[PDB]
């Protein structure tokens, strides 16, 4: 079917008015659009892309760390086994570190070399290439001008904004509410994935070359998960590059398009995607969490799925839910009922545990909280832990307060004789927040 190769939802901006036009915001967050390509974005806003050129970055922080992926240069949209025999899903992506200065040297000399090949005139085997990925631009003192340029974007797409759920977590989540940079040569691949906890993502191509994108809607993610399982791959943790013929045969639609310098790509909640550089270019990217029922629902789903798969959630959805009820007026009836439901579940499970502890003679110690103190995760199994913290007698004594979840502490110390129970929030306080959380009226 032509329905298996659908057109890409696109918007062409000419000027600042197109960029601040409110229906643009509604178009991007609409669940029917798995991806939106906003063409001409940097031009419309007069964004100085030159601030993210390799030359500028070398000048600013030449010793900054780069994660290198070493890959094979593959033809077009395919991925072949090393021998050139069959197309397969597993893709080779070996890891190391370098600096901005050293990758730049390779980026530049790579281009000079293809110029000379182009003037030499005249199934693999395939060449090897290096991709500079996940460069951390969180530091405002190292990247002042770079980060300031991005405040020129319309609010809904900014790293920081009042309507962005990630802004209400109350703490930095590296790569999500901070900017990441990518430095590329042709063939550089970002393999198939969903965003962390299914949050939306924003990507701007700095240029000068293009990137080619492949996109699959959220509700087909299960099919791709089955493919991975059948091919001995972990959907969440392995590197894989889908066989397009396998997908067409399984009746999975695939969006495909080119991102040019200055184009902004909006990846909607839960959308599955993978990317390769066609030319020489840099990209920047981060996440955004719109206040919609669909975004919250999908984030919670992946949060629960991550527990089953023994994978840590970078977004602490329990802490976030309480922050919302504490500080945000919610006027969408569906979204409100979702949050209220989750808080109720958290509260009941917490009340159930606290009473079992008390019935069994275990002391609960008032420990409280400092402000801007992150959510805590279990030092053993890395699940989020809320309110009741399990700390060893020794770690308590030394005031290191190393956190365990209840189950991990029990597996170590059968009657918890090796632990103290620390409580961060009074129950009366939590009941109050829940009870005062009501649906706000909006006429929109
Ligand atoms: Mn992504
Ligand atoms: Zn644990």
Contact between 96 and 70 (Cβ < 8 Å):
yes
Which of 413-428 are b and which e, b meaning 16 or more Cβ less than 10 Å from the residue's Cβ?
eeebeebbbbbbbeee
Q: Please state whether beta strands 189-193 and 364-366 pair in parallel, antiparallel, or not at all (unpaired).
A: unpaired
Which 8-state DSSP code applies to residue 284? E
Kindly state the helix (H) or strand (E) to which residue 287 belongs, with its residue range.
Answer: strand 281-288
Contact between 2 and 249 (Cβ < 8 Å):
no
Cα 226 to chain centroid distance, Å, stands at 22
Full strand arrangement of the beta sheet holding 35-39: 10-12, 35-39, 264-267, 200-208, 281-288, 180-184, 128-136, 65-72, 94-99
At 331 the three-state DSSP class reads: coil
Contact between 39 and 205 (Cβ < 8 Å):
no
> What resolution in angstroms does the PDB record give?
2.1
Expressed in angstroms and rounded, the spacing between residue 377 Cα and the centre of ligand 2 is 8
Closest of 439, 425, 429, 431 to residue 348, by C-alpha: 431
Give the pair of three-digit tokens for residue 218.
């959220």
Give the pair of three-digit tokens for residue 17.
């008015």
Expressed in angstroms and rounded, the spacing between residue 402 Cα and the centre of ligand 2 is 12
Q: Is 408 annotated as a binding residue?
A: yes
* CA gap 135, 54 in Å, rounded: 12
Tally of CA atoms within 13 A in the half-sphere of 290 that contains its CB: 24
Closest of 55, 53, 12 to residue 36, by C-alpha: 12
Residues with CB under 5 A from ligand 2 (ion): 378, 380-381, 405, 408
Q: Is 405 annotated as a binding residue?
A: yes
Give the pair of three-digit tokens for residue 262.
């200055």
Q: Within a 10 A sphere around the Cβ of 252, how many other Cβ atoms?
A: 19
Contact between 112 and 192 (Cβ < 8 Å):
no
Kindly state the helix (H) or strand (E) to which residue 180 belongs, with its residue range.
Answer: strand 180-184
Closest of 166, 178, 214 to residue 323, by C-alpha: 166
Give the pair of three-digit tokens for residue 26.
């509604």
Q: Is 200 annotated as a binding residue?
A: no
Distances from the Cα of 303 to the Cα of 168, 269, 296, angstroms: 17, 13, 11
Q: Is 378 annotated as a binding residue?
A: yes
Expressed in angstroms and rounded, the spacing between residue 213 Cα and the centre of ligand 1 is 10
Q: Please give the domain boundaries of the chain with CATH numbers for all domains.
A: 1-292 (2.60.120.650), 293-359+427-444 (1.20.58.1370), 360-426 (2.10.110.20)
Q: Is 273 annotated as a binding residue?
A: yes
**3-state SS, one letter per residue, for 202-256:** EEEEEEECCEEEEEECHHHHHHHHHHHHHCCCCCCCCCECCCHHHHHHCCCCCEE
Expressed in angstroms and rounded, the spacing between residue 416 Cα and the centre of ligand 2 is 14
* CA gap 142, 60 in Å, rounded: 7
10 Å CB burial of residue 39 (0-12, 13-18, 19+) is middle
């Amino acid at each position: 079917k032509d329905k298996l190769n659908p057109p890409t939802p696109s918007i062409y901006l000419e000027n600042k008015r197109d960029a601040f036009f409110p229906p643009l915001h509604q178009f991007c967050t609409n669940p029917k659009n798995p991806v939106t390509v906003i063409r001409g974005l940097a031009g419309a806003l007069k964004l100085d892309l030159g601030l993210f050129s390799t030359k500028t970055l070398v000048e600013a922080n030449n010793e900054h760390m780069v994660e290198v992926r070493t890959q094979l240069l593959q033809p077009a949209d395919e991925n072949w086994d090393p021998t050139g025999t069959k197309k397969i899903w597993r893709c080779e992506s070996n890891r190391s570190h370098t600096t901005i200065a050293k990758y730049a040297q390779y980026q530049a000399s790579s281009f000079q070399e293809s110029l000379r090949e182009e003037n030499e005139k005249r199934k693999g085997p395939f060449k090897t290439i290096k991709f500079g990925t996940n460069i951390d631009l969180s530091d405002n003192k190292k990247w002042k001008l770079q980060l300031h340029e991005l405040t020129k974007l319309p609010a809904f797409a900014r790293v920081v904004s009042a309507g962005n759920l990630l802004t209400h977590v109350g703490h930095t989540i590296l790569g999500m509410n901070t900017v990441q940079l990518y430095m590329k040569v042709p063939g550089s691949r970002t393999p198939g994935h969903q965003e962390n906890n299914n949050f939306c993502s924003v990507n701007i191509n700095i240029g000068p070359g293009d990137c080619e994108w492949f996109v699959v809607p959220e509700d087909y993610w299960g099919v791709l998960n089955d493919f991975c399982e059948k091919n001995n791959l972990n959907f969440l943790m392995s590197s894989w590059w889908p066989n397009l013929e396998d997908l067409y045969e399984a009746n999975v639609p695939v969006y495909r398009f080119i991102q040019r310098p200055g184009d902004l790509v909006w990846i909607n909640a839960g959308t599955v995607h993978w990317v390769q550089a066609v030319g020489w270019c840099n990209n920047i990217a981060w996440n955004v969490g719109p206040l919609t029922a669909c975004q919250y629902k999908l984030a919670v789903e992946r949060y629960e799925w991550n527990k089953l798969k023994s994978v840590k959630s970078p977004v602490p959805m329990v802490h976030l839910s309480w922050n919302m009820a504490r500080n945000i007026k919610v006027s969408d009836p569906k979204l409100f009922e979702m949050i209220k439901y989750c808080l109720l579940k958290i509260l009941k499970q917490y009340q159930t545990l606290r009473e079992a502890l008390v019935a069994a003679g275990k002391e609960v110690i008032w420990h409280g909280r400092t402000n801007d103190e992150p959510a805590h995760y279990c030092s053993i199994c890395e699940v989020e832990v809320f309110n009741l913290l399990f700390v060893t007698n020794e770690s308590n004594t030394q005031k290191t307060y190393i956190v365990h979840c209840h189950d991990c502490a029990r597996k170590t110390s059968k009657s918890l004789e090796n632990f103290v129970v620390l409580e961060q929030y009074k129950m009366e306080d939590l009941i109050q927040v829940y009870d005062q959380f009501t649906l706000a009226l909006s006429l929109s």
